[PDB]
Design a protein around this ligand. Structure first.
Ligand SMILES: CCCCCCCCCCCCCC(=O)OC[C@H](COP(=O)(O)OCC[N+](C)(C)C)OC(=O)CCCCCCCCCCCCC
Ligand SMILES: CCCCCCCCCCCCCC(=O)OC[C@H](COP(=O)(O)OCC[N+](C)(C)C)OC(=O)CCCCCCCCCCCCC
Ligand SMILES: CCCCCCCCCCCCCC(=O)OC[C@H](COP(=O)(O)OCC[N+](C)(C)C)OC(=O)CCCCCCCCCCCCC
Ligand SMILES: CCCCCCCCCCCCCC(=O)OC[C@H](COP(=O)(O)OCC[N+](C)(C)C)OC(=O)CCCCCCCCCCCCC
Ligand SMILES: CCCCCCCCCCCCCC(=O)OC[C@H](COP(=O)(O)OCC[N+](C)(C)C)OC(=O)CCCCCCCCCCCCC
Ligand SMILES: CCCCCCCCCCCCCC(=O)OC[C@H](COP(=O)(O)OCC[N+](C)(C)C)OC(=O)CCCCCCCCCCCCC
Ligand SMILES: CCCCCCCCCCCCCC(=O)OC[C@H](COP(=O)(O)OCC[N+](C)(C)C)OC(=O)CCCCCCCCCCCCC
Ligand SMILES: CCCCCCCCCCCCCC(=O)OC[C@H](COP(=O)(O)OCC[N+](C)(C)C)OC(=O)CCCCCCCCCCCCC
Ligand SMILES: CCCCCCCCCCCCCC(=O)OC[C@H](COP(=O)(O)OCC[N+](C)(C)C)OC(=O)CCCCCCCCCCCCC
Ligand SMILES: CCCCCCCCCCCCCC(=O)OC[C@H](COP(=O)(O)OCC[N+](C)(C)C)OC(=O)CCCCCCCCCCCCC
Ligand SMILES: CCCCCCCCCCCCCC(=O)OC[C@H](COP(=O)(O)OCC[N+](C)(C)C)OC(=O)CCCCCCCCCCCCC
Ligand SMILES: CCCCCCCCCCCCCC(=O)OC[C@H](COP(=O)(O)OCC[N+](C)(C)C)OC(=O)CCCCCCCCCCCCC
Ligand SMILES: CCCCCCCCCCCCCC(=O)OC[C@H](COP(=O)(O)OCC[N+](C)(C)C)OC(=O)CCCCCCCCCCCCC
Ligand SMILES: [Ca+2]
Ligand SMILES: [Ca+2]
Ligand SMILES: [Ca+2]
Ligand SMILES: [Zn+2]
Ligand SMILES: [Zn+2]
Length: 164
């Protein structure tokens, strides 16, 4: 299983997202592009349609935080847990969160924003985590790139339980 109890279906077909602030660890356009793609590779395996806004009410917020935000003032550090997003059902939740203490890249010698971003996009849509060691929605991080990315069966089949 991967799905969260409490009311996990968004009910919407059209998701609009808002990048609330950008890490300076890599270029804002490169962050935009990767976050673009990282919604869209989900869009391939879901009915949902994703559209950025710079201003207004977002479904999925994309937030970088370290320190004061409202979301654990001290936490983990450089490495460890890179994103810890939450999904709806318990009253609060459905946004993608990224610990700014990482050195965030899209490049081989830093923390890849992308595979973590796709898992954060998926947990926001109402899942929790996958158990299946090959899934993207799995918790552990190893390096894959934008070209060499795939979603796995449990990723696909978990969200089509909700949106299929
Ligand atoms: C041909 C045969 C090939 C065999 C290749 C086998 C596979 C090798 C994989 C190589 C890549 C390793 C990647 C790796 O796991 O990095 C681990 C971490 C960095 O990941 P990162 O998440 O930064 O760890 C963060 C946590 N931190 C700050 C507490 C360390 O960093 C560490 O855990 C620290 C590791 C010890 C570093 C010690 C460096 C020198 C320290 C000074 C020693 C002084 C002695 C006098
Ligand atoms: C006598 C010379 C003959 C000719 C030799 C040519 C050798 C190959 C040179 C090729 C150079 C290719 C172009 C190049 O400079 O790429 C460099 C990359 C960095 O790419 P990237 O960081 O994206 O560039 C960043 C630029 N920035 C800051 C504006 C965003 O990468 C780096 O800068 C990092 C280099 C790190 C290498 C680490 C090696 C690990 C060895 C581990 C062994 C363990 C033994 C215990
Ligand atoms: C024991 C250890 C076990 C490890 C198991 C694996 C663990 C997971 C993988 C470890 C990390 C692998 C990282 C990796 O994929 O590095 C590949 C690099 C760089 O890819 P990457 O840094 O993602 O590219 C970033 C590009 N960006 C910012 C524009 C999005 O690739 C290159 O930079 C290659 C560049 C090739 C340029 C060739 C250009 C054309 C030359 C044509 C020459 C022949 C003509 C006939
Ligand atoms: C063999 C005859 C020559 C054949 C053609 C060779 C062409 C290779 C083109 C290299 C283009 C540069 C790619 C690149 O950025 O590699 C370095 C990455 C990032 O450097 P940078 O992001 O500054 O990170 C540096 C610090 N570090 C290494 C401790 C994490 O640092 C890493 O952590 C990534 C390591 C995995 C991917 C490495 C891709 C280059 C393989 C080169 C193998 C040469 C023989 C050992
Ligand atoms: C006695 C001397 C002083 C002590 C030296 C000790 C040397 C061995 C220490 C091993 C443990 C090091 C812990 C460490 O900091 O890990 C550094 C990173 C891991 O953290 P991080 O950069 O977050 O992982 C990203 C890089 N990735 C995808 C390659 C895993 O991962 C990497 O940096 C791995 C780099 C792999 C190198 C393979 C060869 C790549 C050559 C590329 C050539 C391009 C030239 C332009
Ligand atoms: C095996 C393939 C070898 C390939 C050789 C290719 C030669 C190409 C030279 C021309 C390119 C030079 C690129 C360069 O300056 O790379 C520097 C890197 C990082 O310098 P650094 O200022 O830390 O990078 C700053 C920016 N950052 C953190 C965002 C990446 O430096 C590093 O990332 C570390 C490089 C040395 C790693 C050695 C660690 C283990 C030493 C084990 C020694 C055993 C003694 C027997
Ligand atoms: C050309 C190949 C370059 C690299 C050669 C690497 C050689 C080292 C292989 C080490 C295998 C150790 C055992 C193994 O199956 O670990 C697979 C992991 C986790 O599956 P998982 O059930 O999480 O393992 C659970 C327990 N654990 C972590 C304590 C071992 O999951 C992963 O490690 C994910 C790997 C995703 C693909 C990484 C790159 C290709 C590795 C292919 C190894 C095929 C071995 C049959
Ligand atoms: C065994 C030697 C084969 C040599 C093949 C030649 C390989 C040269 C590859 C060059 C590129 C190396 C890049 C490298 O960074 O690979 C590191 C990976 C982990 O990738 P990744 O998880 O992204 O590292 C990011 C930081 N992390 C760990 C904190 C999350 O590392 C892994 O995922 C684990 C690799 C373990 C390999 C050794 C497996 C156990 C061997 C036991 C039997 C030993 C008999 C001698
Ligand atoms: C001194 C200069 C030379 C140094 C040469 C390189 C040595 C580097 C030492 C550290 C190697 C870490 C490589 C790596 O990225 O592992 C990836 C993951 C675990 O990542 P993670 O859990 O973050 O561990 C990072 C390293 N640590 C513990 C120091 C913080 O794990 C995997 O992806 C799992 C696949 C490999 C599992 C291997 C199982 C090994 C035990 C097998 C015993 C078999 C007996 C029959
Ligand atoms: C340091 C000791 C010497 C080690 C020499 C080799 C060093 C490798 C460092 C680079 C690691 C990434 C290599 C690579 O691209 O792996 C995946 C390839 C095709 O990926 P691809 O579809 O080409 O797009 C690659 C995008 N890129 C470079 C930004 C990651 O292929 C696959 O997707 C198929 C399954 C995985 C195979 C991984 C190994 C590919 C062979 C790389 C060497 C090619 C030499 C002609
Ligand atoms: C006017 C007189 C001139 C006479 C010389 C003419 C030029 C002849 C050679 C031309 C080669 C052109 C290559 C090619 O099609 O380039 C385009 C694409 C790149 O599109 P691009 O968007 O960069 O691909 C994205 C992914 N990436 C970067 C990982 C590949 O790249 C591809 O799609 C990859 C192409 C791979 C081809 C592999 C063919 C086999 C090579 C090894 C054969 C022998 C092995 C023993
Ligand atoms: C140390 C370096 C580490 C990094 C290594 C990166 C490449 C690893 C190769 C692994 C090969 C096996 C898997 C594979 O299909 O990878 C293909 C990659 C990129 O694939 P992909 O992005 O799908 O390319 C699409 C088009 N396709 C499928 C027809 C090639 O193919 C490439 O991107 C090829 C790039 C160089 C192509 C050279 C073609 C030369 C044509 C002219 C030949 C004249 C006679 C020599
Ligand atoms: C050759 C000199 C050293 C070169 C070492 C290069 C080290 C760096 C490797 C870079 C890997 C880059 C990341 C990557 O693209 O991972 C690709 C996959 C990931 O496993 P997965 O994500 O589960 O996708 C599995 C395959 N699929 C598409 C059919 C479902 O992984 C794979 O599918 C690859 C599986 C490779 C199995 C290799 C097992 C050993 C073969 C030994 C045979 C010796 C016979 C004498
Ligand atoms: Ca929200
Ligand atoms: Ca962390
Ligand atoms: Ca940072
Ligand atoms: Zn949080
Ligand atoms: Zn994951």
């Amino acid at each position: 299983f991967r799905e969260m109890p409490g009311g996990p279906v968004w009910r919407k077909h059209y998701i609009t997202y808002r990048i609330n602030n950008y890490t300076p660890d890599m270029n804002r356009e490169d962050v935009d592009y990767a976050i673009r793609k990282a919604f869209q590779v989900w869009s391939n395996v879901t009915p949902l349609k994703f559209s950025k806004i710079n201003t207004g009410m977002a479904d999925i917020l994309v937030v970088f935080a370290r320190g004061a935000h409202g979301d654990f003032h001290a936490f983990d550090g450089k490495g460890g847990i890179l994103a810890h997003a939450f999904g709806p059902g318990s009253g609060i939740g459905g946004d993608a969160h990224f610990d700014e203490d990482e050195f965030w890249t899209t490049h081989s010698g830093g923390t890849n924003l992308f595979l973590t971003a796709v898992h954060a996009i998926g947990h926001s849509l109402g899942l929790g985590h996958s158990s299946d060691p090959k899934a993207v929605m799995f918790p552990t991080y190893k390096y894959v790139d934008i070209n060499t990315f795939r979603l796995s069966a449990d990723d696909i089949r978990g969200i089509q339980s909700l949106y299929g």
